[PDB]
Design a protein around this ligand. Sequence first.
Ligand SMILES: O=P(O)(O)O[C@H]1O[C@H](CO)[C@@H](O)[C@H](O)[C@H]1O
Ligand SMILES: [Zn+2]
Length: 458
Amino acid sequence: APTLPASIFRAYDIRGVVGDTLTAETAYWIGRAIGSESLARGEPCVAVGRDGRLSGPELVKQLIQGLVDCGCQVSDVGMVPTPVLYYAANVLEGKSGVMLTGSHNPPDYNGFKIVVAGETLANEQIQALRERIEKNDLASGVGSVEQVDILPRYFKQIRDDIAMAKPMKVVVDCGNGVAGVIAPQLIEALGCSVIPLYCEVDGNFPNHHPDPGKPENLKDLIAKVKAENADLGLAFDGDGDRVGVVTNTGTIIYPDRLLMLFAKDVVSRNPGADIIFDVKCTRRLIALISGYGGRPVMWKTGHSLIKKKMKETGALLAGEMSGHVFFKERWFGFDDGIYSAARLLEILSQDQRDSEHVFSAFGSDISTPEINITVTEDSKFAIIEALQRDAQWGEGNITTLDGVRVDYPKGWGLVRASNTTPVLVLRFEADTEEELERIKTVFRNQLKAVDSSLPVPF
Ligand SMILES: O=P(O)(O)O[C@H]1O[C@H](CO)[C@@H](O)[C@H](O)[C@H]1O
Ligand SMILES: [Zn+2]
């Protein structure tokens, strides 16, 4: 084994720039490492999937070989969305799966999301593979590969369990990512008319990057929805584990709003059920979950960390501000933008109101988008520690499971470190503009007390 760069081994996945920090050799050894760990957990069967990035076809061969060279039985499911790979690792013989994807990033990025024996790896488990390659703590065997055509199985699974009450007109924007393989087809099969936008799978991303979290990547969907008098706009990120929602009047629906609608529907069918959300989500979620008799669980940001939490709590649903939505009710508990789109359409089809009025019916508060402060990699965790240790917030409920969050009577604010970039991530919400500004001023002062050079942009 060679000496791989440590930067590519991250908190919830492995990611690198192909030809640079991610090469054919890197992919092979990563496959060796994942195969050895899956075999240590008693799992020789590993599903393997890839997204529609230019480097997919080449690099996936190396991943497959590394797993085969452990003695693993590989199920090659070809080019599929991320959640279709997570589904493979739920319905096939083995409970391990590797997805070769670079998510929503520039054409040249690629990487790995890993499930081993039911568990999606995070933090120390990702380092554990890095360390296997360093130590040559690797299995050796003569494995096998079989091709598995899994997409029709998935498609059918969703179609059979969803029941739309009326037809709808839906603009689907796949941003040329791998969602194009199934999203337009399936939504139409549920009973919709589908206006496609950027639905051809093209790893050059010649339109807008498939990242529905940036509002400018929704400009075209919004214009198309209005132009065509459509009922709803939907947008998927590169690999299909995130969705973004636009109303019939062009309103962008923040994922924590989307969760409110899902939470209302799931809890109403399952009294007492647990519902998970990350620390960036509106507080309205607590009240709405509790009101319908559910149990609101606030947790850490990060898909792998949310999946783990759902297994521990038995939550029937989870959601993140980033747009990852995890259904266990009627499903398997992994994030899936395409399945979530199907669940949204189902609910919407049953309402006599247009999508604008269905979502406007949850009212509003004053809130910020995500704010980002670029710090250093040396200092980012230290600042958060310093805030958690020594900051003074005034009267409020202080939550520290991921950064610092303080819920005041009339609003809330959050500061956490990003697990992927040398940045501090903030969000604020409030009943009033004045209160928003009161909270923002508290956070500004507290950050300035740690380091009076920090560029607080509010
Ligand atoms: O970089 P961050 O802010 O730690 O984490 C971000 O990227 C992850 C990508 O998988 C998501 O799971 C998180 O929801 C998102 O906030
Ligand atoms: Zn994604």
